[PDB]
Structure 1
């Protein structure tokens, strides 16, 4: 028992991290097969970042201007291309530590592990969620650019996120591995509005099921609700509306605990209207929305 914000083991991703330098800018790159992926802002100077013309800036660059270092050995760049907001540097050596992998674009509300890196070196691993507004509440400093987000299914690493920037608000923005930003964000040093964020309702319900599985049951009540009634409350508290799709994904947890989804919704409704009254759930004094129903079942069943 016990419930922790658990990240995937980072080993398969650590073997892919490289350092990419172009001019005076150094950031992280992801080496898979004979290709290194990194943010396209690696080609910028400080004056360029205010309004960069990436096409023009990349033209002034040659393969030899991209210094790729894997650990302490240098990689030879034989090709360069821009795909949306990432650069793909073709190297002459295939990474011998390339795991089985996929590039996937995650949906908001889904979770992933981030391997924070500096100078191509892994420094830490943490679990986070893609916010409904397409930002991530990470932990990233200057040089962290190029760090990736991923999920692991047995031996396959699904890369879903590459870190690009920190908005003036302190939240983080980035792309999938094809260079498409999640959200309305652009890779420019400009004020950018992230939308109104909401709480991931299905995840909070999954975490309430994890609390029940782990003995924390004080919040359970003698009430039930309807999807429509619950959603009136969810709207008032900036929670994502619950759909039958969310109810269906909560099926396994509803079966394991024997608590119908709408009964757990009623518990959540009372928690939202009345607060925690100074109590905690799984060691937290607020409602946690960074565990999906899949995460809760995985952790509560020990999937390796």
Structure 2
């Protein structure tokens, strides 16, 4: 019993974190096999950040301009290349702690663990979700760039995020491990803002199924809804539209609890109208949207209470 925002064990990722320095700039790098991956803005000074010409800044660099430190050992850089907004530093030593891994690009609503790092040294681990506006609500200070997001389903590490920046509202933006940003963001210190965010409807529904699995049914009702009527109401509360794909994805949780997806949708409609009236759901007074259908199945028992 119980339900917590749970992160994956971070050990396989801690063994890959290194420190990357280029002149006066220091950030984190991910060391996999004989390559260190890091944000390309490590080659920028504070002046360069407004309109950097990365191709022109990079051509002026040699391998010895990059200092890579793995623990207390200096790694030797023997090559460098840029791929989108990521810098790839070829080093002379393959990481003996390289786990089994893949690079995956996630969609909004998907969750992942973040290993926050400073100076190549891990400080903490927390669970996150890619928001519908492609930002993440992380906890990051200066020096955290290069920190990564990941999932570890089975023994394989799927790296999905590399941290690049913090926006004026305090939320975070970054890229996949191929250097493609999530969202319409650029690695420039220019006027950038997160678009209006929305609630991840399929995740709130999944978390309502988790509450039912843990023995809480006070929020259920005798009503149902059509998918379109649910969306017409939900969007009035800034909730993302629920698609037929989301309904299919909720199938297993619907069968485990005996509650049809459109029946749980009616309960969500009523919760939005009434609030909780002094009650909580899984220890929360708000409707939680950072647990996916897959996360609930992963954490909860297969036997409903």
**TM-score interval w.r.t. the shorter chain?**
over 0.9
Q: Distance in 1 between matches of 2:301 and 2:115?
A: 24
For the residue of structure 2 that corresponds to 1:50, the secondary structure is: coil
Distance 1:184 1:278 in 2: 40
- In 1, the alpha carbon distance for the partners of 2:221 and 2:251 equals 20
Query: Per-residue CA shift, 1:8-58, capped at 9, x if unaligned?
Result: 000100010000000011100000000000000101111111221111111
CA–CA separation in structure 1 for the residues paired with 2:225 and 2:248: 16
Instruction: Describe the superposition over 1:113-165 as per-residue Cα deviations: whole angstroms up to 9, x where unpaired.
Output: 00000000000000010001100000000000000000012110000000000
TM-score w.r.t. the length of structure 1 is 0.98
Contact 1:131 1:197 in 2 (8 A): yes
CA deviation after TM superposition for structure 1 residue 216, in Å: 2.1
Deviation at 1:195, TM superposition (A): 1.7
| RMSD, aligned CA | 1.7
Structure 2 SS opposite 1:133? coil
In the TM superposition, residue 223 of structure 1 has moved relative to its aligned partner by 1.3
CA offsets 1:195-246 (integer angstroms, 9 cap, x no match): 2211110000000000111122211111111101111111111111111111
Contact 1:135-1:173 within 8 A present in 2 as well:
yes
- In the TM superposition, residue 278 of structure 1 has moved relative to its aligned partner by 2.4
Say whether the 8 Å CA contact 1:168–1:191 is kept in structure 2: no
Note if contact 2:50-2:188 (Cα within 8 Å) is conserved in structure 1: yes
Question: What is the DSSP-based 3-state SS (H/G/I as helix, E as strand, rest coil) of the residue aligned with 2:49?
Answer: helix
Q: Give the unaligned 5+ runs of structure 2.
A: none
Preserved contact between residue 20 and residue 67 of structure 2 (Cα < 8 Å): yes
In structure 1, runs of 5+ residues without a counterpart are none
| Contact 2:168–2:193 (Cα < 8 Å) also in 1 | no
Residue 102 (structure 1) shift: 0.4
Report the alpha carbon displacement of residue 193 of structure 1 after superposing the two structures with TM: 2.3
Q: 1:40-77 CA deviation, whole Å, 9 max, x = no partner?
A: 01011111112211111112211001100111111110
**Contact 2:256/2:303, CA 8 A, preserved across alignment:** no
CA contact (8 A) 1:167 1:191 kept: no
Q: How far apart are the structure 1 equivalents of 2:46 and 2:35?
A: 27
Name 2:13's counterpart in structure 1.
Answer: 13
Does the 8 Å CA contact 1:202/1:242 hold for their aligned counterparts?
yes
TM-score of the two chains, using structure 2 as the length reference: 0.98
